[PDB]
Specification:
Strand order of the largest sheet of chain A: 1-3-4-2-5
Number of helices of chain A: 7
CATH topology of chain A: Cytochrome Bc1 Complex, Chain A, domain 1
Helix content of chain A: 40-55%
PDB class: hydrolase
Number of domains of chain A: 1
Number of strands of chain A: 5
Shape of chain A: globular
CATH architecture of chain A: 2-Layer Sandwich
Strand content of chain A: 15-25%
Order of helices and strands of chain A: EEHHEEHHHHHE
Structural class of chain A: alpha+beta
Protein name (chain D): Zinc protease
Oligomer: homohexamer
Keywords: putative zinc protease, Bordetella pertussis Tohama I, Structural Genomics, PSI-2, Protein Structure Initiative, Midwest Center for Structural Genomics, mcsg, Protease, hydrolase
Family (chain D): Belongs to the peptidase M16 family.
CATH class of chain A: Alpha Beta
CATH superfamily of chain A: Metalloenzyme, LuxS/M16 peptidase-like
Distance between the termini of chain A: 31 Å
Largest sheet of chain A: 5 strands, antiparallel
Organism (chain D): Bordetella pertussis (strain Tohama I / ATCC BAA-589 / NCTC 13251)
Largest interface: B-C, 19 and 15 residues
Radius of gyration of chain A: 16 Å
């Protein structure tokens, strides 16, 4: 999944987490969770960061073409903002979701997002060819199809379990971009 | 603006078409954004009204000011057997009774973001900007491409609610059915 | 439908034959849409086979253009310097206007049908593209057309596509033209 | 042609000029001219407007799908920038090319840009169909190839002559967009 | 090559992949072209063997050289309740019994047209070309981007035939099933 | 950067490849930009030395960071008749003689604007940004997607001149030729 949401109204902080096995319920869980966490102003990080003036915009990606595969969350700040506080709020928000469980509505939003994208990919043999090759490079051709099936059958508590299981300190690495 | 959301799982369709306000009206942006709250994502007024209820398999909303007259089109795709008169009726009553379920600020922010994200994609592409400018001239004012953006940027909930309420009425409504024969 | 098929081997003369489309609401419209792909698209197309292995042409093309009023179908051939433009135009129009004695095969229809439906599914999977296709159907006079054209294509019989091409690809509807560079 | 070049780093001014018919041997001259005037940091408009802090960016398009067809040039400014000066500098630049004629280098850059986009169009059957359709809507299907040929054969003097002939005060309309802050 | 063809008028899949010869070997393009004869459009060998027999609903075939080893993968899209054993065995047989049903010139021509049209689209876009040259160099030979093209242009029926029968072999096969949970 | 510019046995081509500096090196952006000036549009150095004079029908220039080691590739497309050795001597001398004909400020602005235009188009599209951050991570540092845009923004003529002259030298030149 790919999310980058910036306010209507450049330093950057990031946090990255190792993903589970490509073919698992947890992987599809965190793919969906990343959308809920970073996509649109309704998302967890935007709501946590922007209205409160700690960040100018937020993003969340799951990057399966890396080995290790990574989920990467972050925020772009304005010139004079507090990187320390921005990074602490970001990781706090991401790592404390048993305190703030996903809603069915949020799950549905992400599921719909994910499946829209798969359908555009499938309708196009050029895109299907790339995706299948990414599947064989991940280890199994069936993944392309398997993952769609996981996403259609995903219940709220799997996705809750995936994110709580993987968005944890022991699996966190931080970054900041501080320009010259 | 552009919305089509279906359920995660030939096909009969029902549609309601509304005339838009003039592109230069300070209600035009109201409707654009309204169509998104109304028809985009599982969270939209139409999806929620038509799909868990099993009245339709998916919903859409489009504003197409490339036409004369300019139009908003909202519709639902049904399954083979679903009651077509029930889907249409629910469809229109959803669109036309927003005074009874008013837009939230969160709904607006959701629609404003999508709109501005689309505008910035147009803007970064000189080919798309040239198209967007000549469409603005075709609607009678080259400024409109930037004016629309500034109006979305400054759009207040009060103004979006009023525009949708003034324009999504039965007297501005043209119904359509497509029944694969 | 849109097709431009070239071979793998002054400037380049082009000859062309123009015909008119049926109304977009007519059964025939998709017939002619599917036909132009059979006539003009890939080395297996009727035009390509008549003009290119025979060395009359460098490539062939076929487009249906309903954004015009009148709506127009355009077929043509790309020439090399030295090739007879009249003999090309001669053969191009003979192929188009004699399908009556050279009827589409089931397999040809399936080739054009598969292409058409793939394009349709790609359009439908994108809200942006659907919004455009819907506005074009409205402009055409029936928002239903976006879906109806699809339904008509998936159910397309060989006899109906033949009859459509045979009634529209006729000399009385035909206007020839040529581009010679410089 | 399409051009929009901004400073590496919502007010706007614009001037718009009627185009000759597509089949006039003036019409590609203006196409190429517009690129010279409006594309990249080497453009006549960028040079006059941007280092001088009258605009953050400039643009220029030929819009042949309008009737009447237009050449549209314009500038985007930051809020405190003098609108009247940017606008007078823009038009002055466009309408005084007899005192600063095109160089062969400029024609070459802009000719390569045109022919590159034409080749990109030509390689896609879908884009060809639309271009052929627009040529027929402009007056003649042959214009699609014939404009390529003219661009290929375009001499500096013809491009000079067409710009100078059509970019004059009797052929232009002005505009400003002053946002409602 | 890419091929994915489905019947017009929650689904299992059965497949078979084979190792390609090295990119730079002469048989490499034969197999690229072969998979198109085999898998692309309703006239393809897989389609005739699996769709009218109602042994499959759609077929695909792709050669993926970015992979190491490179593979050609062929497959069938199934309906719940269709014979999976039979589909795969008819699939694997079709791909392995080509010598009894040799490729026709017309089939070669079709495959070549598609290959070169795609190659021309890559060459037309600097960014794609750079990507393609970059893969060439990773193969250990920049020239390959250009050589493959010339190889395809020259390709003879006899060699495309031998390449396929040399490589689409039970010796070189790995088999797959995807059944929905 | 990617550039291929053509004029209005089969097609032979000749090439010269040079190792790029590290992506995080302050010379990387320099060479990215220099490739544009050297090979993009008729006004490019290679086009001017090779095309008007008829030693080639087109020229090209890429920097390919996704390789290990990263390369600048330059080349020329010839007509069936032309002399390959001459094209290659003229291509290499141009590339290796930039002390003699320094980049202008104008050249640089055209290169920088091209580069930044392509960055804003990526940045505008959340899918594109995700891919670009993956390469950045694969290149060994996520911050590069941004740092390189800041670096292009601030790139001065003399740094760009110096980067190009330092890397486009006889000791870094591997030649190649394609003759059908």
């Amino acid at each position: 999944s790919n999310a980058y949401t910036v306010e209507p109204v450049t330093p950057l902080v990031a946090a990255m987490y190792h993903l589970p096995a490509a073919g698992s319920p947890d992987f599809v869980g965190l793919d969906l969770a990343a959308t809920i966490l970073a996509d649109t102003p309704s998302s967890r990080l935007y709501h946590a960061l922007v209205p409160t003036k700690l960040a100018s915009g937020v993003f969340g990606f799951t990057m399966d073409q890396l080995d290790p595969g990574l989920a990467m969350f972050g925020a772009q700040l304005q010139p004079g903002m507090d990187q320390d506080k921005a990074l602490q709020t970001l990781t706090a928000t991401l790592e404390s979701l048993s305190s703030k469980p996903f809603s069915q509505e949020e799950l549905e939003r992400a599921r719909s997002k994910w499946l829209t994208a798969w359908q555009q990919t499938y309708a196009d043999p050029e895109k299907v060819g790339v995706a299948l090759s990414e599947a064989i490079a991940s280890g199994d051709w069936r993944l392309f199809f398997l993952q769609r099936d996981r996403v259609r059958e995903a219940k709220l508590d799997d996705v809750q379990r995936a994110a709580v299981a993987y968005l944890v300190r022991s699996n966190r690495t931080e970054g900041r971009y501080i320009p010259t």
